[PDB]
Symmetry: C4
Subunit: 309 residues, 4 copies
């Protein structure tokens, strides 16, 4: 079976009521098509309202300097964008011209919001910030202060902060309930600091998120030997708010069984440079191995308890 989440964040999942928020799907399209729809909508409302200026003018003979279809188009433009050159002016003759100018000039603002606000949000969409949030390429398992840990690194490239930033992790692997039920990609949260508000990040320079492999960890019975045998995947999620706006964003990444390295450890990145801190981003992803017992956390702890003198 192939992975559920790519290293960059896109999922490998494929899926009537999409027109209950035509706006939500409007902001998704790539620029070129957004810029085309924007044109379409604008031109066709210049068409429709321009066609009604030609319908009432046909019954009258309100209108100054209008001739064919090529001229009735240029009046609807001077009105909706409120250009109004002054070559094509309006007069007092018909009642059907006064009330339709109102309808056009008002509905010109409604078309303005739907599009300008639309154009705003996509320029200002937060998913972009998540580009400059980065995860180590592998995760490691090595010892820390006595206890075995699953560790991955997290970084923020942009100098700006990410407010109320947090990290959570979900372990994904199929399982079978003792009752028979097979559950395809069963998600189960991994502890990465949630019981101590240690999962609340002060992300400035790159941090190593550590999940300790205790009794309640999924990695409790995985040993160095069993690890490559397993068929699991660790989804890593980082959420928080772009300091510069009120936008909330999410950056994701994944670790499949083969990308977790047993016995390794992260290369430091920090150096103090004459009154500032220098983050050597070259050593970010890089790791190195150190002496690391090959036993499962469950056994390590069992032998450590049997060592009571």
């Amino acid at each position: 079976i192939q992975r559920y989440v790519r290293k960059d964040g896109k999922c490998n999942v494929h899926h009537y009521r999409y027109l209950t928020d035509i706006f939500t799907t409007l902001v998704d399209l790539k620029w070129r098509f957004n810029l085309l729809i924007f044109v379409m909508v604008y031109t066709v409302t210049w068409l429709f309202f321009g066609m009604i200026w030609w319908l009432i003018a046909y019954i009258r003979g309100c209108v100054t300097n209008l001739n064919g279809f090529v001229s009735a188009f240029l009046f609807s433009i001077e009105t909706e964008t409120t250009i109004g050159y002054g070559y094509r002016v309006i007069t007092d003759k018909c009642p059907e011209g006064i009330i339709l100018l109102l309808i056009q000039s008002v509905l010109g603002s409604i078309v303005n919001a739907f599009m300008v606000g639309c154009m705003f949000v996509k320029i200002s969409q937060p998913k972009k910030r998540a580009e400059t949030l980065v995860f180590s390429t592998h995760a490691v398992i090595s010892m820390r202060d006595g206890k075995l840990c699953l560790m991955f690194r997290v970084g923020d490239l942009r100098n700006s902060h990410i407010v109320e930033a947090s990290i959570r992790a979900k372990l994904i692997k199929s399982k079978q309930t003792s009752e028979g039920e097979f559950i395809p990609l069963n998600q189960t949260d991994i502890n990465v600091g949630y019981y101590t508000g240690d999962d609340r990040l002060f992300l400035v320079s790159p941090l190593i998120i550590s999940h300790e492999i205790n009794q309640q960890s999924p990695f409790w019975e995985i040993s160095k030997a069993q690890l490559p045998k397993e068929e699991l995947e660790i989804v890593v999620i980082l959420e928080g708010m772009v300091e510069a706006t009120g936008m909330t964003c999410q950056a994701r990444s994944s670790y499949i069984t083969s990308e977790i390295l047993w016995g390794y450890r992260f290369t430091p990145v920090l150096t103090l440079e004459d009154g500032f801190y220098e983050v050597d981003y070259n050593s970010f992803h890089e790791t190195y191995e150190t002496s690391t017992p090959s036993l499962s956390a469950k056994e390590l702890a069992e032998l450590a308890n049997r060592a009571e003198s």
Copy 2:
């Protein structure tokens, strides 16, 4: 008694200070009326300010090419939408014309914001996204890995993510305090992962939310037999943020006693298709039954503890 929340989310509840935020009620109205008010406000400010252009012009004889009421209307329009055709131009004569152009042109922007921003928010309201978030039609109770569970499925139809997404559930049923007090629709939260951040969803492909029926569960003493006898309703709430904007949204649904099925289980939806995952949305709501003890979780556990060999 009838239900508190409909399967789609609307509540069956009916309720001076509504004019302390005339804006909040302005965004509620259906489009046609919003589009009418928009017209009203725009036309009547063209009226008022146009009427004051006719009042000061009456005392003067500032004004170029103005005649009756049908012409004074077309000047206020060329000014507030800043059309300004150049047929009706302003001159240097009266002081009461210079300062009133300022008042109109400035208050033309104030009317613009109140309406354009108004038009923005409703196009961009989040309640819409909640349309494409969906709940299984029934909930089930069956065994999982030894312990009895109340389970309902949750789905997101749109390919876009829902950031910081979470699920919570409230059990609604009237009760009487031993002291006598009757409480009409007393709400009491149901555990659906809150003590482990398992209620924090990574909602991509459809998930089964499971509430285990332990000592602290309301369903602790409900057996298969008692269930249809009960008069309870489970409100299911899903909250989180639209990836595409900073909007927070809520999707709700309900389970009344008869819609909870004892002994059943959800049909899988996942299939791996040549390097992506295929979610067969047809089996979403569908369930099937399996061997499931008819005893209450309280008794099941009591007999399992008595089985100690």
Copy 3:
């Protein structure tokens, strides 16, 4: 001593760097003054930029149909609001006119945002929604299912929802540390459901928030007799998001010692009406008394434990 928070929410507290976000203070002013500043800023930029059109025209003799100060003002207006009547047109003569039109037309949009966006936010400020969120006028203490409770009611008048809505309460009273230190208005949080996500509200029809008076409660040793002797105040806070926008809001209220009624209980508000629920908002604030022991929760529990047969 007088109270810290009024029944409506304003605090009784009085307090250089206020110009580090001149915007934040700009949205605070009442409408009339906001509407005046808006005028000021607009007129004075029409003045400044209009004065520079008169400075370069003085060195030239770029300019069509301009005379005195009363005419140079009407050109700056036709340019910044992009009215441009066509009576006062621009020509090719001087270089100092071409680049200044650019500077004005660009800085006309900068003045537009600062003001239009300003005008948007205040119309769309959330503090308003908090008007239609309401708290019972008194709080009560009576028994519930064996244990003594401090209870106040909460309501939402508007039919719209309040997403991710929550309630928290802080007990305010001065205290002296055994070491001598006197602390003026020491705040200490009261449990109103925080350890069970029962403080997470599904606020539709009016809810009674209950704080049980256990060992950890401040009201643990307050008896009916001692209550009127105490000098405490309960601040009640409700926070959450306006369904209609991404705004987060806060509604506050207070209970001073005299407004907490010992031995009373809230009048029900619910009635089921032919397929909807009718909330009789008249009985909202209203209470009534019932048999309620006059002893402190600490003693009640002590005697209940001594009753072990």
Copy 4:
């Protein structure tokens, strides 16, 4: 080694994909340059689109009153800002003029959003509010009601509220894992009320945030003597939402070993003035010393337990 966070909040840290959200970096620049780019973009699109009006007019001989380059520039301006003086008018001759007016007038709104919305956000950026949130200049350690506490004061200068406001603290100091691994600026959260929702602030008048120095505190074994020997730094973070908008903000500050005062205590700031509370902001930062044991919290508690009579 020098500190990680300055007393005002800037960090002493220095750090391709920055063009995946050119918008995010657009809002960062200081005003003068923002105002220059705004000019650049506007002028160069007036250039490009103006140059295409000169290209199609060259193949024709659509155009009224156009001559050299100095005149073709003034047409593109009357069109994109929708000024349209009426001296330079459009006619029916060529098809390449009609469709290009559409392209310009539409892309004039796209350039409008990107810039006006840009201009909006920076005026409305939240980081500013964090200016008027303030931290005591030192932190103290003294006794409170028996137990030793690390205390710093927090204030909000602006009369407006900060919704859903919270305080958290991270202790920063390098450490070595018993396994050998040296960790440069290892962060570890300090308890400031997180297990009781006491870290949820009702920040109106200035509050003393207290971290009790218990077994789980980092300051458990630091005595008065050892404190000046240590090389630690306490980062203090305050997060929450600007009442006036939906913006979330963060105010930070730091305490290095030398700024924590052992044996001192904060000067009160509150006085009740004729029906309001007067906060004497002069005594905000100020402290004073009182009798305070010089032993480490670990020992204090050890001797208090040995005192059992």
